[PDB]
Amino acid sequence: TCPFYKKIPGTGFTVDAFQYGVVEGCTAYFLTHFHSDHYAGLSKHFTFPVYCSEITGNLLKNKLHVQEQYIHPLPLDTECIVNGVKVVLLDANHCPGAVMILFYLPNGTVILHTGDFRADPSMERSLLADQKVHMLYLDTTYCSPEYTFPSQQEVIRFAINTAFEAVTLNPHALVVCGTYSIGKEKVFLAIADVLGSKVGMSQEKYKTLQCLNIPEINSLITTDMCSSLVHLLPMMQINFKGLQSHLKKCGGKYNQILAFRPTGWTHSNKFTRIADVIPQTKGNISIYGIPYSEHSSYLEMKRFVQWLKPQKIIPTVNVGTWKSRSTMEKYFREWKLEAGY
Ligand code: NI
């Protein structure tokens, strides 16, 4: 049964609620983004209207085979009427195609559902600037002050400079980047661009990337692994055993691997600056864990909420324990006392 924090009151709508069967009272199912915890349950047999971005609808049709007649893609930044209710989709600064959803209820209440997001000051100049929001359904993934990480730009600078140095020292080094979902494409695209290479990958991952409307993509990725010196592998293979095995397969073209695992936060963030990050090394294999986040840090989240000044906050992440819920509620009250709303 569908939990309350996935239901939008005063509507027929649910958000990211495909794993509960037929939800009583639901006339339209919204999907914020194409990550498995959120789409869990969708398939070619789904027969209710799904509302989403264009990119998400490309993935639904080509990866999950949802039939076209049930996919309802909406443009961003554009007032649309769905089953009698005005909605807007906003860029969430998460993975490709990820949105936040503004719902203008018939009674005058305005609700923002962030989906998954990485808050940014650029959101203070979107269509949110123009009216009051009563209720916020908030991505609270990193809602505690221990969760710090650098800007995405600092992380990519570190990655590019690290890969360019290694490969210029040793033109026979291969670079490998881990992936297990969409998101974080800048990591492997920025490294391939500094090296003058396309990114090589499996047919299944190429297919996924071809749904993402990235400009000039045909110039940047390939299934011909032999032509590429940046390879994408499953995240599970980014370990010494898996990388040794891969290097065997390359037929003596290479004699070293430099590998990247884009994680979110890890506790090595509480001690070490990005500039000071070092790899784990075994022989001719080195593995860097880099803190590339597509969710808000604590400080980014706090800034957004103190700017928006909602009347009520409903967390959508870390909701399963009383300790998590009590921690989050204490920070919400702090923020509100500090800012004065
Ligand atoms: Ni996500």
Coordinates of C-alpha atoms and ligand atoms in Angstrom, one line a residue:
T1 CA 0.0 0.0 0.0
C2 CA 1.1 3.4 -1.1
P3 CA 2.5 5.7 1.7
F4 CA 0.9 9.1 2.4
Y5 CA 4.0 11.1 1.4
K6 CA 3.5 9.8 -2.2
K7 CA 0.0 11.2 -2.5
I8 CA -0.9 14.8 -3.5
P9 CA -4.1 15.8 -1.4
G10 CA -7.0 17.3 -3.3
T11 CA -6.0 15.7 -6.4
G12 CA -6.1 12.3 -8.2
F13 CA -2.3 12.3 -8.3
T14 CA 0.6 10.2 -7.0
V15 CA 4.4 10.8 -7.3
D16 CA 6.9 7.9 -7.9
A17 CA 4.3 5.3 -6.8
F18 CA 4.4 2.4 -9.4
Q19 CA 5.1 -0.6 -7.0
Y20 CA 1.8 -0.6 -5.1
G21 CA -0.5 -2.0 -7.8
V22 CA -3.6 0.1 -8.7
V23 CA -3.7 3.0 -6.2
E24 CA -7.3 3.7 -5.2
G25 CA -8.3 7.2 -6.4
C26 CA -5.3 7.7 -8.7
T27 CA -6.1 9.2 -12.1
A28 CA -2.5 10.2 -13.1
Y29 CA 0.9 8.8 -12.0
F30 CA 3.8 11.3 -12.1
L31 CA 7.4 10.0 -12.4
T32 CA 10.1 12.5 -11.3
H33 CA 13.1 10.7 -12.9
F34 CA 14.4 7.4 -14.2
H35 CA 16.0 5.9 -11.1
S36 CA 14.9 2.3 -10.2
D37 CA 13.8 3.1 -6.6
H38 CA 11.4 5.6 -8.2
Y39 CA 10.2 3.7 -11.3
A40 CA 9.9 0.3 -9.5
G41 CA 6.8 -1.4 -10.9
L42 CA 6.6 0.1 -14.4
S43 CA 6.7 -2.2 -17.6
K44 CA 5.1 -2.7 -21.1
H45 CA 1.9 -3.8 -19.3
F46 CA 1.2 -0.5 -17.4
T47 CA -2.1 1.0 -18.7
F48 CA -2.6 4.3 -16.7
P49 CA -1.4 7.8 -17.8
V50 CA 2.3 8.5 -16.8
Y51 CA 3.3 12.1 -16.7
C52 CA 7.1 13.0 -16.9
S53 CA 9.7 14.9 -18.8
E54 CA 10.6 14.2 -22.5
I55 CA 13.9 12.5 -21.5
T56 CA 12.2 10.3 -18.9
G57 CA 9.5 9.3 -21.5
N58 CA 12.3 8.3 -24.0
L59 CA 13.7 6.0 -21.3
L60 CA 10.2 4.5 -20.4
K61 CA 9.5 3.7 -24.2
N62 CA 13.0 2.3 -25.1
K63 CA 14.2 0.7 -21.9
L64 CA 11.1 -0.4 -20.1
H65 CA 8.8 -0.7 -23.3
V66 CA 6.0 1.2 -21.9
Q67 CA 3.5 1.8 -24.7
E68 CA 3.5 5.2 -26.3
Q69 CA -0.3 5.9 -25.8
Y70 CA 0.3 6.0 -22.0
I71 CA 3.4 8.3 -21.9
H72 CA 2.6 11.9 -21.5
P73 CA 5.7 14.0 -21.7
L74 CA 5.5 17.7 -20.6
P75 CA 7.8 20.6 -21.5
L76 CA 9.7 22.3 -18.7
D77 CA 9.0 25.8 -17.3
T78 CA 5.5 25.8 -19.0
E79 CA 2.1 25.9 -17.3
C80 CA 0.1 22.7 -18.2
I81 CA -3.4 21.5 -17.2
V82 CA -3.6 17.8 -16.1
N83 CA -7.0 16.4 -15.3
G84 CA -8.2 19.8 -14.3
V85 CA -5.2 21.0 -12.3
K86 CA -2.4 23.4 -13.3
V87 CA 1.1 21.9 -13.0
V88 CA 4.7 23.0 -13.9
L89 CA 7.8 20.8 -14.3
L90 CA 11.2 22.4 -13.2
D91 CA 14.7 21.2 -13.7
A92 CA 15.8 19.3 -10.5
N93 CA 19.6 19.5 -11.1
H94 CA 19.7 15.7 -10.4
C95 CA 20.2 13.2 -13.4
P96 CA 19.2 13.8 -17.0
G97 CA 15.4 14.3 -17.3
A98 CA 14.9 14.8 -13.5
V99 CA 12.1 17.3 -12.5
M100 CA 10.5 19.0 -9.5
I101 CA 6.7 19.3 -9.8
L102 CA 4.6 22.5 -8.8
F103 CA 0.9 21.7 -8.2
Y104 CA -1.6 24.6 -8.1
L105 CA -4.5 23.0 -6.2
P106 CA -8.1 24.0 -6.9
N107 CA -8.5 25.4 -3.3
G108 CA -5.5 27.8 -3.7
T109 CA -2.9 25.7 -2.0
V110 CA 0.5 25.5 -3.9
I111 CA 2.7 22.3 -3.4
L112 CA 6.3 21.8 -4.6
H113 CA 7.5 18.2 -4.8
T114 CA 11.3 18.3 -5.3
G115 CA 11.7 14.6 -6.5
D116 CA 15.4 14.0 -6.1
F117 CA 17.3 17.3 -6.4
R118 CA 20.6 19.2 -5.8
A119 CA 19.5 22.6 -4.6
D120 CA 21.1 25.6 -6.3
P121 CA 20.8 29.4 -6.1
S122 CA 19.7 29.4 -9.8
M123 CA 16.4 27.9 -8.6
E124 CA 15.7 31.2 -6.7
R125 CA 15.1 32.7 -10.3
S126 CA 12.9 30.1 -11.8
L127 CA 9.0 30.2 -11.8
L128 CA 9.3 29.6 -8.0
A129 CA 10.1 33.2 -7.5
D130 CA 6.5 34.3 -8.5
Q131 CA 4.3 32.8 -5.8
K132 CA 4.0 31.4 -2.3
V133 CA 4.4 27.6 -1.6
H134 CA 2.4 26.1 1.3
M135 CA 3.7 22.5 1.3
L136 CA 7.2 21.2 0.3
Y137 CA 7.8 17.4 -0.3
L138 CA 11.6 17.5 0.2
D139 CA 14.5 15.2 -0.8
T140 CA 16.2 14.9 2.6
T141 CA 18.9 12.5 1.6
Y142 CA 21.8 14.4 3.2
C143 CA 19.8 16.3 5.9
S144 CA 22.6 16.5 8.6
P145 CA 25.5 19.0 8.9
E146 CA 28.1 16.2 8.6
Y147 CA 27.3 15.9 4.9
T148 CA 29.6 18.3 3.1
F149 CA 31.1 17.8 -0.3
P150 CA 32.7 20.1 -3.0
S151 CA 31.0 21.7 -6.0
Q152 CA 30.5 19.4 -9.1
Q153 CA 32.9 21.8 -11.0
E154 CA 35.8 21.3 -8.4
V155 CA 35.3 17.5 -8.6
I156 CA 35.4 17.5 -12.5
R157 CA 38.6 19.7 -12.4
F158 CA 40.2 17.1 -10.1
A159 CA 39.2 14.2 -12.4
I160 CA 40.3 15.9 -15.7
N161 CA 43.7 17.0 -14.2
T162 CA 44.3 13.5 -12.7
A163 CA 43.5 11.6 -15.9
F164 CA 45.4 14.0 -18.2
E165 CA 48.5 13.7 -16.0
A166 CA 48.4 9.9 -15.8
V167 CA 47.9 9.3 -19.5
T168 CA 50.5 11.9 -20.6
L169 CA 53.0 10.2 -18.3
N170 CA 52.0 6.8 -19.7
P171 CA 50.3 6.7 -23.1
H172 CA 49.6 3.0 -22.5
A173 CA 47.3 3.7 -19.4
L174 CA 43.6 2.9 -19.8
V175 CA 41.0 5.0 -17.9
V176 CA 37.9 3.2 -16.5
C177 CA 34.8 4.9 -15.0
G178 CA 32.1 3.0 -13.0
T179 CA 28.2 3.5 -13.6
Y180 CA 25.0 1.6 -12.5
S181 CA 22.3 4.2 -13.3
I182 CA 21.9 7.4 -15.3
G183 CA 23.4 10.5 -13.8
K184 CA 27.0 11.7 -13.4
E185 CA 27.7 11.6 -17.2
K186 CA 29.9 14.7 -16.9
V187 CA 32.6 12.5 -15.1
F188 CA 33.4 10.2 -18.1
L189 CA 32.5 12.9 -20.8
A190 CA 34.9 15.5 -19.3
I191 CA 37.8 12.9 -19.0
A192 CA 37.3 11.6 -22.6
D193 CA 37.2 15.2 -24.0
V194 CA 40.6 16.1 -22.3
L195 CA 42.1 12.9 -23.7
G196 CA 40.8 13.2 -27.3
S197 CA 38.9 10.0 -27.1
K198 CA 35.3 8.7 -27.4
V199 CA 33.9 6.9 -24.5
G200 CA 33.5 3.1 -25.0
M201 CA 30.7 1.1 -23.4
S202 CA 28.3 -1.9 -23.8
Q203 CA 25.4 -1.8 -26.2
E204 CA 22.9 -1.6 -23.3
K205 CA 24.6 1.6 -21.9
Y206 CA 25.0 3.2 -25.3
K207 CA 21.2 2.6 -25.8
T208 CA 20.5 4.4 -22.5
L209 CA 22.7 7.4 -23.3
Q210 CA 21.1 7.7 -26.7
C211 CA 17.7 8.6 -24.9
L212 CA 19.2 11.6 -23.0
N213 CA 19.1 14.5 -25.6
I214 CA 22.8 15.3 -24.9
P215 CA 24.1 17.7 -27.7
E216 CA 26.5 16.2 -30.2
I217 CA 26.4 12.7 -28.3
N218 CA 27.2 10.8 -31.5
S219 CA 30.6 12.6 -31.4
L220 CA 31.3 11.5 -27.8
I221 CA 30.4 7.8 -27.2
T222 CA 30.9 4.5 -29.0
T223 CA 30.4 0.7 -28.7
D224 CA 33.8 0.1 -30.4
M225 CA 35.9 -0.5 -27.3
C226 CA 39.1 -1.0 -29.3
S227 CA 38.9 2.6 -30.6
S228 CA 38.5 4.2 -27.1
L229 CA 40.9 4.8 -24.2
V230 CA 38.1 5.7 -21.7
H231 CA 35.9 2.6 -20.9
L232 CA 32.6 2.5 -18.9
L233 CA 32.0 -0.6 -16.8
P234 CA 29.4 -1.6 -14.2
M235 CA 30.1 -0.2 -10.7
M236 CA 30.4 -3.7 -9.3
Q237 CA 33.4 -4.4 -11.5
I238 CA 35.4 -1.3 -10.1
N239 CA 37.7 -3.4 -7.8
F240 CA 41.2 -4.9 -8.2
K241 CA 39.8 -8.3 -9.3
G242 CA 37.4 -6.9 -11.9
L243 CA 39.9 -4.4 -13.3
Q244 CA 42.6 -7.1 -13.6
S245 CA 40.2 -9.2 -15.6
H246 CA 39.2 -6.3 -17.9
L247 CA 42.9 -5.4 -18.6
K248 CA 43.4 -9.1 -19.7
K249 CA 40.7 -8.6 -22.3
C250 CA 42.3 -5.6 -24.0
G251 CA 44.9 -7.7 -25.8
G252 CA 48.1 -6.0 -24.5
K253 CA 47.1 -2.6 -25.7
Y254 CA 47.4 -1.3 -22.1
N255 CA 49.7 -1.9 -19.2
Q256 CA 48.1 0.3 -16.4
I257 CA 44.5 1.2 -15.3
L258 CA 43.4 4.4 -13.6
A259 CA 39.7 3.9 -12.4
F260 CA 37.1 6.3 -11.0
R261 CA 34.1 5.4 -8.7
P262 CA 31.8 8.5 -8.4
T263 CA 30.2 7.9 -5.0
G264 CA 27.9 10.3 -3.2
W265 CA 29.3 11.2 0.3
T266 CA 31.7 8.9 2.1
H267 CA 33.1 9.6 5.7
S268 CA 36.6 10.4 4.1
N269 CA 34.7 13.8 3.3
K270 CA 34.8 14.7 7.1
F271 CA 38.6 14.7 7.0
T272 CA 40.0 15.2 3.5
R273 CA 39.8 18.1 0.9
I274 CA 39.2 17.2 -2.8
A275 CA 42.7 18.5 -3.6
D276 CA 44.2 16.0 -1.1
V277 CA 42.3 12.8 -2.4
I278 CA 44.5 9.8 -3.1
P279 CA 43.7 6.4 -4.7
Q280 CA 43.9 2.9 -3.5
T281 CA 46.6 1.1 -5.5
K282 CA 47.6 -2.6 -6.2
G283 CA 50.4 -3.0 -8.7
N284 CA 49.5 -1.3 -12.0
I285 CA 45.8 -0.6 -10.9
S286 CA 44.8 2.6 -9.0
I287 CA 41.1 3.4 -7.9
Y288 CA 39.9 6.9 -7.0
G289 CA 36.6 7.5 -5.1
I290 CA 35.4 10.9 -6.0
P291 CA 32.6 12.7 -4.1
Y292 CA 30.4 13.7 -7.2
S293 CA 26.9 14.3 -5.7
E294 CA 23.6 14.8 -7.5
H295 CA 21.8 15.5 -4.2
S296 CA 21.9 18.7 -2.0
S297 CA 24.5 19.1 0.7
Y298 CA 23.1 20.1 4.1
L299 CA 24.1 23.8 3.5
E300 CA 22.5 23.8 -0.1
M301 CA 19.3 22.3 1.3
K302 CA 19.1 24.7 4.2
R303 CA 19.6 27.8 1.9
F304 CA 16.8 26.6 -0.4
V305 CA 14.3 26.0 2.3
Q306 CA 15.1 29.3 4.2
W307 CA 14.6 31.1 0.8
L308 CA 11.3 29.3 -0.1
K309 CA 9.8 29.6 3.5
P310 CA 7.2 26.8 3.2
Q311 CA 4.5 26.5 5.8
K312 CA 4.9 22.7 6.1
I313 CA 7.7 20.2 5.1
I314 CA 7.1 16.5 4.3
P315 CA 10.4 14.5 4.0
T316 CA 10.6 11.9 1.2
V317 CA 14.0 10.3 2.3
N318 CA 15.2 8.8 5.6
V319 CA 11.5 8.4 6.7
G320 CA 11.8 4.8 8.0
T321 CA 13.4 5.4 11.5
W322 CA 12.2 7.5 14.4
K323 CA 15.8 8.8 15.0
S324 CA 16.0 10.0 11.4
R325 CA 12.5 11.7 11.6
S326 CA 13.3 13.4 14.9
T327 CA 16.7 14.7 13.6
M328 CA 15.1 16.1 10.5
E329 CA 12.3 17.8 12.4
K330 CA 14.8 19.5 14.7
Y331 CA 16.7 21.0 11.8
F332 CA 13.5 22.2 10.1
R333 CA 12.6 24.1 13.4
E334 CA 16.0 25.5 13.7
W335 CA 15.9 26.9 10.1
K336 CA 12.6 28.4 10.6
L337 CA 13.6 30.2 14.0
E338 CA 16.8 31.5 12.4
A339 CA 15.1 33.0 9.3
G340 CA 11.9 34.1 11.0
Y341 CA 9.1 32.5 9.0
Ligands
NI1 NI 17.5 9.6 -7.8

